[PDB]
Design a binder for these strands. Structure first.
Ligand SMILES: [Mg+2]
Ligand SMILES: [Mg+2]
Ligand SMILES: [Mg+2]
Ligand SMILES: [Mg+2]
Ligand SMILES: [Mg+2]
Ligand SMILES: [Mg+2]
Ligand SMILES: [Mg+2]
Ligand SMILES: [Mg+2]
Ligand SMILES: [Mg+2]
Ligand SMILES: [Mg+2]
Ligand SMILES: [Mg+2]
Ligand SMILES: [Mg+2]
Ligand SMILES: [Mg+2]
Ligand SMILES: [Mg+2]
Ligand SMILES: [Mg+2]
Ligand SMILES: [Mg+2]
Ligand SMILES: [Mg+2]
Ligand SMILES: [Mg+2]
Ligand SMILES: [Zn+2]
Ligand SMILES: [Zn+2]
Lengths: 80, 62, 91, 97, 212, 136, 101, 25
RNA sequence: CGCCGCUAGAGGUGAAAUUCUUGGACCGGCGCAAGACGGACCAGAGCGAAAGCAUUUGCCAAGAAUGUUUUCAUUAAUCAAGAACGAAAGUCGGAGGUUCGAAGACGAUCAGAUACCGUCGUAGUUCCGACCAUAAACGAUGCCGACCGGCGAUGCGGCGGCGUUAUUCCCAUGACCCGCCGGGCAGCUUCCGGGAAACCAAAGUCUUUGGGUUCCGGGGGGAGUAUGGUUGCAAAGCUGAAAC
RNA sequence: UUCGUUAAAGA
């Protein structure tokens, strides 16, 4: 007799992405503050391609299976 | 071609198709305390001085 | 229409000189009567001259090829070995 | 019926195992089926160790070994006292001490 | 007949700075007729282990010698190769490890060219539960390239003196162990075999330079 | 004859190859080079019977004969190289060498280090037996 | 010349003695294998199409490659007519009558 | 008698009867 | 096979012999040529649709899985006919031939062997081209989808953990430890249930009998046989009775 | 190391 209607949020986080009820995505959108002059660039979390800044022409996110690894540790926020 | 003598220290067990020989790890009197295992048929106790015609062999146990 | 089903080009001979011999001559007759793609002009005008000699129709560049094909597999192996011994440590 | 679940060997994911020759009878058996042990023997019998140590040039500065991949088959190992028969409840066991 | 009463004895002189030069004594038939006494002695070889050349080092890592010439009842030898013993090579081959191999040809400073090998066994770490200890095989290919690359720039510009002075304390194995820990902690990397396959010239002057 | 060395105290070395097989046992004394054979006595040279030439008794008699010839020719120490029929046959040595080492260590012949230089193939070449191999 | 090429160089139309303008390995689809050079006593082994390993000089020349026209004996002559034209082209080597007959 | 060698001897008998048919069509 | 040294035996067996040997076999040291083979590392491990696949490096395309707030929008599952691969053996050409070795010739043991044992050795076993399409081709277990206990591990990704060890140093990858997720080869217990039982997390959700679909069994022999048809150079393969 | 075979029922 498990409470399937009102489960635990820790259980819903530990379950698989599509196997659970709401099928919420594990991805997010992060705001990388580029150290060039001022720019704050929105970027997808599981970035599949390179990200070039339009101001300083530097690589923001490296292409990596899983989620994109970063450069020197610029800050980012979780906006949902 | 030496012929040496040896007194029995311990008795391991009996061996043979008839169960007649006795595997005896005897000792060496004329030298230091070294170890060879000899097949002796007939009755034997601990302390029986044995006539060895060849001190080069070594019998195995099972 | 497909008029012959097994003899192919060898039907010009007929009933003579054995099924196995005709089958073994069939492949090399197709090889000597098929036009080959020229590696120089890019066309398919390799016309068969006498044995050992191949001749492309356009640009008249005569090449010394195999006896029945344009390139022998042994000849390709020899050419690969010659270029390997060429670029192997500069002689 | 099937006597075992493993069907003798350990081929479960693949479909072919290259055979390796036996030692006694020299029969090609797949290596997941043949009795493949690793014997570690001192090259000198334990009663001759003292003799070679007394008659050695060095004062106990060498101790050689002998490592042999012993490779029997199940037809000769039962005859040669390795893989003796067991019970139905005893076939679910591991390596002996 | 008694040919051993007629046979002569030449003692063997090792090349310089192992620690010593005495090796042993060999039999010579005699000098008689066409067969000179220095005929087979130019072609004789030796396969001698350690603990009598390097003053109580490890007993394995044997050495292959070849007698270059003879000089006054003293047959002088020279380096020909380096092997390891069969028991040590067959030991440290565990059923639950990975054995990474390498081999490369290289030319020395002078006209000597040699084919040198390399063996490396993977290591179980301390406080490890997983008994497998394998790799993803891309690290294995990378470390084969790495151990093929390191020996090239050691034995590129180094002749027999420096390569013997490196193969006595196993400085190549310690250098591979130092440059190895970033990829995987591999256990007891050795060279296990090296042989001479190209010899340019006799060069008794270079042999005297090898002496000192 | 005095031999190679005068005023003894330094060991004169020789390589002793022991080729142990299931049907015969070889003991062989060479110098450190590997060419000049000093002494060579097999099992059949000491035992008349063909079935008993693989015996440890045959190995001990051949070893005593070899050790006597080596004491007469004047060598002291032996580096022992043990080998067997290791090409495609059993890589383990026969029963003769286990007592032949004792017979060398008994009558002189100071033993140096012993190595198992056995001819081991790379990758298990074709075996003499066949598909189902030796039977009975 | 064979002293320039490395070992294993597949060549054809080589020379026995240096200066006879090509003698060995001249038929269609045949070659030789150059091996075993020598610094002193300038000689070179060549594997011939017959399988013989002939030691020759190191100054004689050889065209690199195989002779074109390889596989000429792959086709059966398949009738007496093509054999008649072949031997009429070559030479009168064809009164081939059985010696028992 | 094994089923293997029974099938092989019936195969040989089939070959013999086929050669009999080819001999006397 | 070429050299060097010693010497009377060296193979092979339960035992001997067939074989080689004072013309130097066997044995040890050096080198040369040939072809096959990739051990130990190699595991109830991995990949491939199966058959199968294990020395190093480079090139060529292909793919499972995973990470995918990416794209199209039912494109899907199984399959009569048909088609592509398909171990070994065998067949037809070209190259070569080290070991083993169908047949074969001998040497042995037995009443008898032409067999198991030993010596030699042909086709073959090796490579590149064509054919045959069979096996205990086995998980003796069709494919796709869903559900129904647990435990400890393993292979591959992904994620989380001021833990440890690795460069020069905060900044990224490497190796070890704990947990989760997806699909994969598996292991142990169980009264989940099945079945004649062996046993099985599938061989369960089956008289409380129905998710979709394909091929096959109707007592045992005759018999996968004859006659047909069809494919193959051939051996043979596919389909396939009846009388009794 | 060699050592083959003993009809049919009838409890
Ligand atoms: Mg049964
Ligand atoms: Mg299979
Ligand atoms: Mg004729
Ligand atoms: Mg005629
Ligand atoms: Mg007439
Ligand atoms: Mg003779
Ligand atoms: Mg030899
Ligand atoms: Mg095949
Ligand atoms: Mg022909
Ligand atoms: Mg053929
Ligand atoms: Mg036979
Ligand atoms: Mg044979
Ligand atoms: Mg035939
Ligand atoms: Mg079938
Ligand atoms: Mg199916
Ligand atoms: Mg992981
Ligand atoms: Mg990473
Ligand atoms: Mg009878
Ligand atoms: Zn053209
Ligand atoms: Zn066996």
């Amino acid at each position: 007799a498990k409470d399937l209607l009102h489960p635990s949020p820790e259980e819903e986080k530990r379950k698989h992405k599509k196997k659970r009820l709401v099928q919420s995505p594990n991805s997010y959108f992060m705001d990388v503050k580029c150290p060039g002059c001022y720019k704050i660039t929105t970027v997808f979390s599981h970035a599949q391609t390179v990200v070039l800044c339009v101001g300083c022409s530097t690589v923001l996110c490296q292409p990596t299976g899983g989620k994109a690894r970063l450069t020197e540790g610029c800050s980012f926020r979780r906006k949902q | 071609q030496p012929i040496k003598l040896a007194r029995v220290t311990k008795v391991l067990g009996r061996t043979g198709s008839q169960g007649q020989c006795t595997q005896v790890r005897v000792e060496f009197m004329d030298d230091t305390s070294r170890s060879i295992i000899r097949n002796v048929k007939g009755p034997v106790r601990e302390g029986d001085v044995l006539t060895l015609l060849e001190s080069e062999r070594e019998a195995r146990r099972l | 229409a497909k008029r012959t089903k097994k003899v192919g080009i060898v039907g010009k001979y007929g009933t003579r000189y054995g099924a196995s011999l005709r089958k073994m001559v069939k492949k090399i007759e197709i090889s000597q009567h098929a036009k080959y793609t020229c590696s120089f002009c890019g066309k398919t005008k390799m016309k068969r001259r006498a044995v050992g000699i191949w001749h492309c129709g356009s640009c008249m560049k005569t090449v010394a090829g195999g006896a029945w094909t344009y390139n022998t597999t042994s000849a390709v192996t020899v050419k690969s070995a010659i270029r390997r011994l060429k670029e192997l440590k500069d002689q | 019926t099937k006597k075992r679940r493993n069907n003798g060997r350990a081929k479960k994911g693949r479909g072919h195992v290259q055979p390796i020759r036996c030692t006694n009878c020299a029969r090609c058996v797949p290596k997941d089926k043949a009795i493949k042990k690793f014997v570690i023997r001192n090259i000198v019998e334990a009663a001759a160790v003292r003799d070679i140590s007394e008659a050695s040039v060095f004062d106990a500065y060498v101790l050689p070994k002998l490592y042999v991949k012993l490779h029997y088959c199940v037809s000769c190992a039962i005859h040669s006292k390795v893989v003796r028969n067991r019970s139905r409840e005893a076939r679910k066991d591991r390596t002996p001490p | 007949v008694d040919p051993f009463s007629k046979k002569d004895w030449y003692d063997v002189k090792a090349p310089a700075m192992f620690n010593i030069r005495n090796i042993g004594k060999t039999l010579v038939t005699r000098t008689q007729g066409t067969k000179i006494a220095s005929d087979g002695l130019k072609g004789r070889v030796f396969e001698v282990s350690l603990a009598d050349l390097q003053n109580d080092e490890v007993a394995f890592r044997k050495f292959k010698l070849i007698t270059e010439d003879v000089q006054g009842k003293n047959c002088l030898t020279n380096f020909h190769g380096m092997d390891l013993t069969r028991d040590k090579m067959c030991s440290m081959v565990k059923k639950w490890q990975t054995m990474i191999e390498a081999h490369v040809d290289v030319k020395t400073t002078d006209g000597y060219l040699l084919r040198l090998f390399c063996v490396g066994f993977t290591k179980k770490r301390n406080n490890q539960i997983r008994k497998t200890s394998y790799a993803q095989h891309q690290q294995v290919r990378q470390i084969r390239k790495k151990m093929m690359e390191i020996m090239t720039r050691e034995v590129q510009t180094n002749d027999l003196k420096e390569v013997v002075n490196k193969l006595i304390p196993d400085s190549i194995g310690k250098d591979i162990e130092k440059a190895c820990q970033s990829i995987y902690p591999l256990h007891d990397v050795f060279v296990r075999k090296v042989k001479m396959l190209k010899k340019p010239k006799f060069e008794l002057g270079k042999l005297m330079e090898l002496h000192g | 004859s005095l031999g190679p060395q005068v005023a003894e105290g330094e060991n004169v070395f020789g390589v002793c190859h022991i080729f142990a097989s299931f049907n015969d046992t070889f003991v062989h004394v060479t110098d450190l080079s590997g060419k000049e054979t000093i002494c060579r006595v097999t099992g059949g040279m000491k035992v008349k019977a063909d079935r008993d030439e693989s015996s440890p008794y045959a190995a001990m008699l051949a070893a005593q004969d070899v050790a006597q010839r080596c004491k007469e020719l004047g060598i002291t120490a032996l580096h022992i190289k043990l080998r067997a029929t290791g090409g495609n046959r059993t890589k383990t040595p026969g029963p003769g060498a286990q007592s032949a080492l004792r017979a060398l260590a008994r009558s002189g012949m100071k033993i140096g280090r012993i190595e198992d230089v056995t001819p081991i193939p790379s990758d298990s070449t074709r075996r003499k037996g066949g598909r189902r191999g030796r039977r009975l | 010349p064979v002293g320039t090429m490395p070992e294993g160089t597949i060549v054809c139309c080589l020379e026995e003695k240096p200066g006879d303008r090509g003698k060995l390995a001249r038929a269609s689809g045949n070659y030789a294998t150059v091996i075993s050079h020598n610094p002193e006593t300038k000689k070179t082994r060549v594997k011939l199409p017959s399988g013989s390993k002939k030691v020759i000089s190191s100054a004689n020349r050889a065209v690199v490659g195989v002779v074109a026209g390889g596989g000429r004996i792959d086709k059966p002559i398949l009738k007496a007519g093509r054999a008649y034209h072949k031997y009429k082209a070559k030479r009168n080597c064809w009164p081939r009558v059985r010696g028992v007959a | 008698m094994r089923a293997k060698w029974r099938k092989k001897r019936m195969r040989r008998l089939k070959r013999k009867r086929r050669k009999m048919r080819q001999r006397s069509k």
